[PDB]
Design an enzyme around this catalytic site. Structure first.
Site, short mmCIF file in Angstrom:
data_model
loop_
_atom_site.label_atom_id
_atom_site.label_comp_id
_atom_site.label_asym_id
_atom_site.label_seq_id
_atom_site.Cartn_x
_atom_site.Cartn_y
_atom_site.Cartn_z
CE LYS A 30 0.62 -1.17 -8.24
NZ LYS A 30 -0.19 -0.18 -7.49
CD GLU A 33 2.96 2.38 -0.80
OE1 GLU A 33 3.63 1.62 -0.05
OE2 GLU A 33 2.29 1.88 -1.75
NE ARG A 34 -5.32 1.50 0.55
CZ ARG A 34 -5.40 1.72 -0.76
NH1 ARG A 34 -4.37 1.55 -1.57
NH2 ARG A 34 -6.54 2.11 -1.32
#
Lengths: 487, 466, 25, 48, 467, 414, 138
Positions: free
Chosen positions: B154, B180-181
Site C-alpha cells: 500500500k 490517522e494513527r
C-alpha cells in the site's frame, strides 16, 4: 455566591444537577458538602450536570457544591511500584501511603507525530505463539481480544511475569515496568491476581490500578487514564513501561452509563457518539519516543471482550481499528486443546519482524509458513482417505508445529529456549515423533538443555542468532535426546 | 463580532451573539486559550445563539468565555509552500518547520464545479503502472477505491503514483489522513522523506500532507478531508494541473460524520449512520473532478465494515467510484509486485467506447488467459501437469509469462531494491501484452519477464539469462 | 436466521466443500 | 471413479454457492439487528 | 417528617415534603392502610419532592395521602431468631408464627467489603453431580452461578445441591426466593420441615428463608435479594460462621429494576435494560462474598432471557462468579439431565495445581472429545459416516457415550425421571470417565451409559439391556 | 365484578354483564378483579390430577389441580382444542356424585372474533358442557381496557370456587392479545415503551394473574384454581421474549409444532420441549405405573431417530429404542372431542410400554387401539372399573391385562 | 444531483412530472425517467428524520410509499374525451445484492405495472442488456 459555589437542584442515578458554579471549567473536580467529589461533565446554560464519585445517598437537594479549581491529576513515579491503588492513585492494599513526589494529570494529549520513532525494541511475552507469530515491540498497542474465559488475562499475566528476566538484570534499557488496570472486575479476582503476581515476585516491578465492580461509574471510567499517566512517567524518562487495560469493554460501559444519564444522544448499542474518541485518545498515549526525547516507551495491551465472537460489534470494532494488531483467542481452539487459544491465522502484528530478534526470525519465518500451508489443508485430514504424500507431509508438519505452540500458564520462556524448541520441529526432528508426545518431548528436552546446555543457549542468546556451529551442536543434542526418548 | 459561550456539552459549544450572528459554517475563535480552538458553526438555534462543534478539546471552557466570529469558514494556507509540509485541519503546521507562509488562504467549505465547468469526456489518466494502466485504468477526475492494507505494498504504491504524477503530468499530490494513527502518520512521513517525495532541504517536495489524527474530536476528523481537498483544488483552479488526492481512509470520513451527527442530536438512520450520509459524501466527492481548468483524481482507501459490501457506509461510497485497485496478499506471495490483483481490480472506463477496441481487447485478453490458467491450476497440482494439450500447455506458459510481465520495479523503491524503477508508457503496455498474447515471445523464458519495464527489457534479460 | 445458526451452518459447509473438493481430485 | 469425480465436483460447487449465499444472508441479518436494536432505543428515549 | 403523595403511577409514587426531605434510600410508611406500605426513596426531583418505589401494591392510594419519613433505609430483624422463619422484603414474618424477636435490626442497604477484606483460599466443594464435579468444580466460599433459559433445570439443580450439600452443612443457610414461583417456596418450606432442616418446635433450625415472589410489585422484587443477602451477612460477620447462600433467581433483581426504570425517567440502555444495570448489579454482587470474618458459599440461579447468553443481564453477571454451570435447552431437549453444557461451564479451580492432574487431564480429555464430536456433528449430518477414519468414528462413539455418562438421575427429580436419584463421589466420577476415555467400554452400548450413577451401573445396565 | 354459581352456563363481557341476552345474572357476590394471590402459608402441594382426556398430556405432561400449565404454539397448531377437549372431559365427574372431583370451568376469550366464540359456545352447548362453564368474552372490537381486564375478571370468578372448597379451571385464550391490549392502553397513557414496545412490566402483567391459580390447604377449604393460559409463538420460536416470559411463570408448557401437526402427529405435542413441573405427583398410580419413564424415553428416542437418519451400523439396544419410540408415538396420537377416561389411557399405553406392540406394524397401531379399546370397554368393564377404582394396577389386574392384550393382539393379526 | 439540498432532490421528480403532464394534458405524449427513486427516498428520509418523524422499517418514515404512489399515479393514458394524450414513467430503483424484497423495492413494485430486473450475474457473463426474462414482467 453562585460563582464559585452551587446548590444541588436534584440528585439521582449518580448525576447531580447543580445550580450556580458559574465559573467551573469543563471536566473540573468539584466537592459536595458531605465530602464526596464529582466531575463536571455537562456545563449547561441553567445548570451543571455533575458526575458523582460515590454513593449519592450522601447528597441531597440543596447540598452546597464548591469548586476545587483543580483538574484531575494523580500520583506518579517509582514509589507506586508493588502497590495496589484505586483509580485516583489512593492505596487500597492497606500497606501505607504511597510516597509520591510527582503528580501527573490523567488526561493529557498523546505525544505528537514528531517526537517518535519506529517501534524497534522487542517486547517479549514468553509465549511462543505470540513471540514468534504476533510479535509486540515497545511503543506498540496490541489488543488481546476474545469471548469470556478464553485466556485473555492469562496472556497479560504471563507477559508481566516474564519481565523479571530483565528486571533482575543489569541492562537498564531492557527493564520494563508493568501496569495492570482492572476495570469492572470483582475484588476477589484482583486479589487472586495480585497473589499470583506476588508469588512470582513480579509485584516488585508492577503497579495495580483497580476500579472494581462496586466502584462508581466515573472511577471505572477514569481508571485507564489514571493508569496511563503513571506509565507515562516512565515513558518520558527514558524508561520503558507496559500497560494492560483489563477490559476496555467494561470502561466503555461505565462511560455509556454516564452519557445516557446526562442525557447525551445515544447511537448504536446506546453508546455516545464520542466513545471512539474515548479510546483513541487513550491508546494513542502509548508510543516509542525518540532519543531526542529519551528513547523511552509505553506499550499497551488493551483487552476487549467480544460476544459470540462478534469482532464487528461496536466497541470491538473501534479498538481493533485503533491498535497495531490483535491476538484473537477462540473457545473452539481452547476446548480442542490449543492453549493458549490463539487463532494464529487471524491474529496480527502490524509492527511485525521490526520487533522480532534475529534468532527468532531465523525460525519464526519458516514456521509461520508451514503453518499457513497446513491451515490450507487441515480440513482434509479427517477425510483424507488417500492424499498424496506432498500434502500428507504438510499435515504432519502442521500438527507437530501446532503442538509446539501449546503452553502451560505462569511459565513464560526466555527467547533462547523458545527458538531451541521451535528449531526442533521446524527442522523436522519431531516429524517421526507422535503428536501425543511433543508436549512431553519439549518439556523434557528443554529441561535437559536448560540443565546441561546453558552454554549453547548463552551463545544463541549472545550471538543473537543460530550460528552454523550452535546449529550443528543442536542437531546432535536433539538427535541423541530423541534416540534416548524413544527407547 | 464577539460572542459569549452559553453552554459546553462535550465537543458541542453553544455561543450567543449580542449583535451580529455568524452564518452556518463560519469558524469562530475562542478567546484566551493556550492554543487555537476553532468552533465551526452548525445551526442557528434562534435567540441569537449558534450551535457549534469544537475542532479540539473543550476542556476548561467557561460559560461566558469570549468568542470571535472569524467571519468565515475554516481557511487554510494554500499553494506551493504547502508541498512537503504537514498540516492540521485549520491549516496549522504540525511538523514543526515553522509557519506555512503562502500568499493565498482558502476556505475549506466550497461548492462544486457547476455543470458548465464539467468536462464532457472520459480520459484515462496514465500512472505508468502496467497492471493499473492495462486492466483497471484510473480516470481523470475520477475516484479510485484502493483495497488491501498491510504487508501488501500500500504505501509504496501510494508513493510511486505520487512520483509518477509529478513525472508524467507535472501534477502534484495531497495526502489527507482522515483519522490517522499518530504512529502511522509519522511513519508515513519519514518513509516519503527517505524516498524523496518529500524534501526537507530544498523545494522539490511533490506532496503536501494534511492530517486528522485519531485523537481529534469528531468535527476535526470530519473536516480534515475537506482541508486536503482545498489544497488540491488550488493546484487545479489556480495552476490548472492534474492533482492527486489521497483520502486515507474513506470510511473514517463517514464515521466522523456520524459522530458529529449524533452529537448534534439527530436521529441516526439505517445501521446507525447519519441521516445525511449521502449528502455528507456527495458534497465532498463532487468537488473531485476534471473541470476546464484541470482535474483532481482521488485515491481513496476503503475499509468495508463487517465485510458487508451492502453496509450503508460502503454502498454509499461505491456510488462515486470509477475504479478499484485491489492490493492482494496472495499475489504478493508470488513475489509479484505491485501486488495488484488483475482479475479483482476494476474500472468503469474499461469500455472500447472509451479506451478503444485495441486497449479493450488486450485487457480482455490478459484477463481471460489469467482466468483460464486459474482453472487449470487445480488440475496441475493433483493429476499432474501433463494431460495438458499442445493448447493447454500454451495458455499456461503465456499466462505465467503474463503474470510476471504484470509485475514491475518502482522508482520509489530504488533506495531499497538496488534496482532501477520503470515508468512504462500506455503504448508500451498494450504492445507488451499484445505480443505475449500474440505468441511473439513464447520462446522466451518466464524469469525474463520478472520485474522489468517495457517488453524490450524482457528480451534483453533473456540474453543475460543465456 | 440467527447469526449463531448462520455461523454454525457456514462452519460445517466450509469443511464439506473442503473434504468434497479433495475427494473430487 | 468418473461418477465419484463428477458427484464430488457438483457437491463442492453446491457447497461454495451455499457458502456465498449464507454469507450474504449473514451480513443482511447483521445489519438489520443493529438497525433494529438502535431504533428500539431511540423510540424509548424520544417518548420521554 | 410527614410528606403527602402527589402522584401515583404504578409502583412509582412521588411524595412532597414541606419541611425535611428524607434522604435517598430512606423508607417511608404510607399512613391510612390496612397493611404496611413502605416506599423506598429513589430520587430527589427537586421542589422538595422525592420519587419513590413502592414495596407493595399501590391500589387505593390517593393524591394527598400522608406519608411519614421513617428516618432510615429498610431495616430487618437479623440474628439467629431468623432461622426456621419466613420473612418479607421488609422483614415481616409471613409464616404466621408470630414476631421475630431479634436483638438487632439491620438496614438492607450497606457498602460491600473492602479489598483488604478479601480472602483467597480455594477448596473444592464436592457435590455428587458428575458433570459439575468433573468439569466445573464448585469451591467452598466461592461464588457459583447456574445459568439457564426458562425451564432447563436451574431450580432442580439448586434443589439437589440443597440436598447433597446444604443438608450436611454445619453452619447456617439462607435461601432467598427473588421473583420466582410461590408454589415453589411452599414446596421447599414443607420439605425443609419434613427433613428437620427447619424445626418448628425448637431452635434446631439451620436455615432462614426470605421471599419476594413473582406475584409482587417490581419494588419488592428489586429488594428481596437485599433482605436475603442482609440476613446472610449477619451470620458471616456478627457470628463469623460458614454460610451457604441460595438465591433463585438473581436475574429477577435486575428485571425488577428494568420494570420501573422508565417510570424513573431514564433513556433505556440496549435491549431495554436500564442504563445502571451493571453498577446496580455491582454494588449488590459485591456484598455476596466471603471475607476474612466469615465465609459465604452463594449458589445463584441466573435466568437467561430468550435463551440468549449475550443478553445484557446474564452477560453482565459472569464476572461476578468463580464457577459457572451453564444449562442448555439443546441438551435438555435430548433428555440429558442435568442439561449442563460441558463446553460452556467453567470453574476457577479447574487448575492442575488445585484439583490435581488426574482430575484435570480427564476433564480436559472429556472436553476435547466432546468438542471434537461437536465439530463433526454438522458434517456427518450431510456427508454421512462411511468416509470417516476409524480413528474418527471411535471419537464419535466415545463422545456419544460420555454425553450420556454425564447425565444422572437426581434425587429431587424422581417425579421427573422415573429413576432413583444417585449421588456419585468424586473418585467414582474421575475413574468412570478415565475408563471411557481409555477405550475400556467400547463394547457396551451407549444406552447403558444413560441415566445411571457410577460406571458399574452402566456395566450392569448393559447386561439388563443385553436382553 | 359479579362472582358465583349464578354465572355458570352464561356468556359475560369483561365486566360481568351478560351478552347471551338470556337475562340478568342473579349475582349476590362481588369480587375485586385485582387481588394478590394467596401467599405461602394458605396453600398445599398440588396432588390431585386434573385429567385432560388427552393421553399425550395426561401421560407425559401431567396437570394437577392448582397447577398452571401453558398451551403455546404458532397460529392454528391446535392450542384451543387442548382447552376444549379438557372442558368437555370434565362432564365425567360433573355428572357424577362426588363434589370434590367436580371441576367448574371458565373460558376467557381475548382479542378473538365474536363468530369464533359463538362457534365455541355452540360446541360447548352441544357437548352439554355449558352447564358447568362461564365464558368471559372480550373480543376484537371491545376496547383495549376491556381486553386487558378480561383475564383478571375471569380469574376472580374462578377464585369464588377456589376459596370455597370447590374446584375451578380457567383458560386464558390467549395472553398474547391481552399483552397487545395492555401495550396499547399503556402507550396511550404515554408510559414509555420498553423491550419490544411493551410496557417494562409485561412480565408482571401475567405473573400477578397466573399466581392466582393455586391449591389451598384444607385450612382454607382445600379448593383450587387451575389455569391453562394460551400464548401464540411466531415461526415456532419459543425462545422469544414473551413466550419465555410466560413459560417462566407457569408450572410447565405444552408446545405444539406445525411440523408435527402436518406430519400427522396430532396433538402436535413436542415431547422434548414440553414439561410439567408437578411431575407424577399429579398422576394416578395407574398412570404413574405405565408412564413413569416414558417421557425421557421418547426424548432419547427422538435424538437417535435423528442420529440414524442414516442407519449407522446400529446395535440392538438402539434398534429396540427406535422400535418402541415409533410404536409409542402412534399411541399418543388422538382425535378431537373424544377425551378418554383415565383407565382407558392406562389400558392402551400399557399395551405399548410393555412391548406387546413391538411386532405390530406402526401403521396398524391406531386401528388396533380402536379395536382393543372397544373390546375391553364392552366385554371387560370389570378390569376397567377396578383399575379405575383401585386407581392402581394390582398384580392380578396386571395379569388379566397381559392376557387380554396378547391374545386379542394375535386374533387381531390373523 | 448529489450536491443539491435534500429538499431539491426530494422535489425534482414532482417538477419533472408536472412538465410531463403538460404533454399528457394536451393530446400529446411524454416519457418521464426518474433516476433513481432510491436516492429520492433517502433524501425524503433525511428530511423526515430531521423533522423528527418516527423512523420505521429501515428508518424510513411511514409515508415513503405515498412519496412514490402519488408521483407514479400521475403517469397515465387519457381517453379521447380528454385528449388521448399520455405520460409514461420509467422510474429507476437500485437494489442491494439483488435483494428485491427490501422495503423500497417492494414498495415500488407494488405501484408500477411491471418491472425489468437486470441481473449482475447476467451482466458479467456477457448478457446485456442484463435483463432477467423470467422475473421481469409487463
Amino acid at each position: 455566591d453562585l460563582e464559585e459555589t452551587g446548590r444541588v437542584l436534584s440528585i439521582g442515578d449518580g448525576i447531580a444537577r447543580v445550580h450556580g458554579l458559574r465559573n467551573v471549567q469543563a471536566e473540573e473536580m468539584v466537592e459536595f458538602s458531605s465530602g464526596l467529589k464529582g466531575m463536571s461533565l455537562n456545563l449547561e446554560p441553567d445548570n451543571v450536570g455533575v458526575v458523582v464519585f460515590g454513593n449519592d445517598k450522601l447528597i441531597k437537594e440543596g447540598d452546597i457544591v464548591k469548586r476545587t479549581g483543580a483538574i484531575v491529576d494523580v500520583p506518579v513515579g517509582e514509589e507506586l511500584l508493588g502497590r495496589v491503588v484505586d483509580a485516583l492513585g489512593n492505596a487500597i492494599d492497606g500497606k501505607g501511603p504511597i510516597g509520591s513526589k510527582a503528580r501527573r494529570r490523567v488526561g493529557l494529549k498523546a505525544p505528537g507525530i514528531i517526537p517518535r520513532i519506529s517501534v524497534r525494541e522487542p517486547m517479549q511475552t514468553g509465549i511462543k505463539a505470540v513471540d514468534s507469530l504476533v510479535p509486540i515491540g515497545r511503543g506498540q498497542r496490541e489488543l488481546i481480544i476474545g469471548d469470556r474465559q478464553t485466556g485473555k488475562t492469562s496472556i497479560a499475566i504471563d507477559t508481566i511475569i516474564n519481565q523479571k528476566r530483565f528486571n533482575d538484570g543489569t541492562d537498564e534499557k531492557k527493564k520494563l515496568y508493568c501496569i495492570y488496570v482492572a476495570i469492572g472486575q470483582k475484588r476477589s479476582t484482583v486479589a487472586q491476581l495480585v497473589k499470583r503476581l506476588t508469588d512470582a515476585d513480579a509485584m516488585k516491578y508492577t503497579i495495580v490500578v483497580s476500579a472494581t465492580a462496586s466502584d462508581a461509574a466515573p472511577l471505572q471510567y477514569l481508571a485507564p487514564y489514571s493508569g496511563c499517566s503513571m506509565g507515562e512517567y516512565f515513558r518520558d524518562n527514558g524508561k520503558h513501561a507496559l500497560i494492560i487495560y483489563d477490559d476496555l469493554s467494561k470502561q466503555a460501559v461505565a462511560y455509556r452509563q454516564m452519557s445516557l444519564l446526562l442525557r447525551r444522544p445515544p447511537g448504536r448499542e446506546a453508546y455516545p457518539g464520542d466513545v471512539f474518541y474515548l479510546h483513541s485518545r487513550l491508546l494513542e498515549r502509548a508510543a516509542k519516543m525518540n532519543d531526542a526525547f529519551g528513547g523511552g516507551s509505553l506499550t499497551a495491551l488493551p483487552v476487549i471482550e467480544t460476544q459470540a465472537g462478534d469482532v464487528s460489534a461496536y466497541i470491538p470494532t473501534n479498538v481493533i481499528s485503533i491498535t497495531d494488531g490483535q491476538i484473537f483467542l477462540e473457545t473452539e481452539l481452547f476446548y480442542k486443546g490449543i492453549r493458549p487459544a490463539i487463532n494464529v491465522g487471524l491474529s496480527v502484528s502490524r509492527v511485525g519482524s521490526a520487533a522480532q530478534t534475529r534468532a527468532m526470525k531465523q525460525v519464526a519465518g519458516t514456521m509461520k509458513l508451514e503453518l499457513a500451508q497446513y491451515r490450507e489443508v487441515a480440513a482434509f485430514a479427517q477425510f483424507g482417505s488417500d492424499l498424496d504424500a506432498a500434502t500428507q507431509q504438510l499435515l504432519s508438519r502442521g500438527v507437530r508445529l501446532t503442538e509446539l505452540l501449546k503452553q502451560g500458564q505462569y511459565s513464560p520462556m526466555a527467547i533462547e529456549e523458545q527458538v531451541a524448541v521451535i528449531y526442533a520441529g521446524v527442522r523436522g526432528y519431531l516429524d517421526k515423533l507422535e503428536p501425543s508426545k511433543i508436549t512431553k518431548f519439549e518439556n523434557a528436552f528443554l529441561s535437559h538443555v536448560i540443565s546441561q546446555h546453558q552454554a549453547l543457549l548463552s551463545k544463541i542468546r549472545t550471538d543473537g542468532k543460530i550460528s552454523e556451529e550452535s546449529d550443528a551442536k543442536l542437531k546432535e543434542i536433539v538427535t541423541n535426546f530423541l534416540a534416548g526418548f524413544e527407547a | 463580532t464577539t460572542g459569549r459561550i452559553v453552554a459546553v456539552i462535550g465537543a458541542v459549544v453553544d455561543v450567543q451573539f449580542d449583535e451580529g450572528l455568524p452564518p452556518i459554517l463560519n469558524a469562530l475563535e475562542v478567546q484566551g486559550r493556550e492554543t487555537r480552538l476553532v468552533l465551526e458553526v452548525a445551526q442557528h438555534l434562534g435567540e441569537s445563539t449558534v450551535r457549534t462543534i469544537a475542532m479540539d478539546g473543550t476542556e476548561g471552557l467557561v460559560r461566558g468565555q469570549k468568542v470571535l466570529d472569524s467571519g468565515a469558514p475554516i481557511r487554510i494556507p494554500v499553494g506551493p509552500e504547502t508541498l512537503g509540509r504537514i498540516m492540521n485541519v485549520i491549516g496549522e503546521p504540525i511538523d514543526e518547520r515553522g509557519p506555512i507562509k503562502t500568499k493565498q488562504f482558502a476556505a475549506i467549505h466550497a461548492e462544486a464545479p457547476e455543470f458548465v465547468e464539467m468536462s464532457v469526456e472520459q480520459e484515462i489518466l496514465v500512472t505508468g503502472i502496467k497492471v493499473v494502466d492495462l486492466l483497471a485504468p484510473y480516470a481523470k477526475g475520477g475516484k479510485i477505491g484502493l483495497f488491501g492494507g498491510a504487508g501488501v505494498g500500500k504505501t509504496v504504491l501510494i508513493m510511486e503514483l505520487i512520483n509518477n504524477v509529478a513525472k508524467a503530468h507535472g501534477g502534484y499530490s495531497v495526502f489527507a489522513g482522515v483519522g490517522e494513527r499518530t504512529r502511522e502518520g509519522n511513519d508515513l512521513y519519514h518513509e516519503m522523506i527517505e524516498s524523496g517525495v518529500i524534501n526537507l532541504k530544498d523545494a522539490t517536495s511533490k506532496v503536501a500532507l494534511v492530517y486528522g489524527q485519531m485523537n481529534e474530536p469528531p468535527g476535526a476528523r470530519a473536516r480534515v478531508a475537506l482541508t486536503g481537498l482545498t489544497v488540491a483544488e488550488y493546484f487545479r483552479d489556480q495552476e490548472g494541473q492534474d492533482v492527486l488526492l489521497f483520502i486515507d481512509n474513506i470510511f473514517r470520513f463517514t464515521q466522523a460524520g456520524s459522530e458529529v451527527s449524533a452529537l448534534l442530536g439527530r436521529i441516526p438512520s439505517a445501521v446507525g449512520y447519519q441521516p445525511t450520509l449521502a449528502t455528507d459524501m456527495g458534497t465532498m466527492q463532487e468537488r473531485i473532478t476534471t473541470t476546464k481548468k484541470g482535474s483532481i483524481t482521488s485515491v481513496q482507501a476503503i475499509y468495508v465494515p463487517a465485510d458487508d459490501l451492502t453496509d450503508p457506509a460502503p454502498a454509499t461510497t461505491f456510488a462515486h467510484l470509477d475504479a478499484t485497485t485491489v492490493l492482494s496478499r496472495a499475489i504478493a506471495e508470488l513475489g509479484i509486485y505491485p501486488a495488484v490483483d488483475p482479475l479483482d481490480s476494476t474500472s468503469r472506463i474499461m469500455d472500447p467506447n472509451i479506451v478503444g477496441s485495441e486497449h479493450y481487447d488486450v485487457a480482455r485478453g490478459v484477463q481471460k488467459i489469467l482466468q483460464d490458467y486459474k482453472s487449470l491450476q487445480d488440475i496441475i497440482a493433483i493429476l499432474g501437469m501433463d494431460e495438458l494439450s499442445e493448447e493447454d500447455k500454451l495458455t499456461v506458459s503465456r499466462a505465467r509469462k503474463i503474470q510476471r510481465f504484470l509485475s514491475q520495479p518502482f522508482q520509489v523503491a530504488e533506495v531499497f531494491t538496488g534496482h532501477l524503477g520503470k515508468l512504462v508508457p500506455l503504448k508500451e503496455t498494450i504492445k507488451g501484452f499484445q505480443q505475449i498474447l500474440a505468441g511473439e515471445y513464447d520462446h522466451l523464458p518466464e524469469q525474463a519477464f520478472y520485474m522489468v519495464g517495457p517488453i524490450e527489457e524482457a528480451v534483453a534479460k533473456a540474453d543475460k539469462l543465456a | 436466521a440467527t447469526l449463531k445458526d448462520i455461523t454454525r451452518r457456514l462452519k460445517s459447509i466450509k469443511n464439506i466443500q473442503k473434504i468434497t473438493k479433495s475427494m473430487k481430485m | 471413479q468418473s461418477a465419484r469425480m463428477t458427484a464430488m465436483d457438483n457437491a463442492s460447487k453446491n457447497a461454495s454457492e451455499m457458502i456465498d449465499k449464507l454469507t450474504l444472508t449473514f451480513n443482511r441479518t447483521r445489519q438489520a439487528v443493529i438497525t433494529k436494536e438502535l431504533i428500539e432505543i431511540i423510540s424509548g428515549a424520544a417518548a420521554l
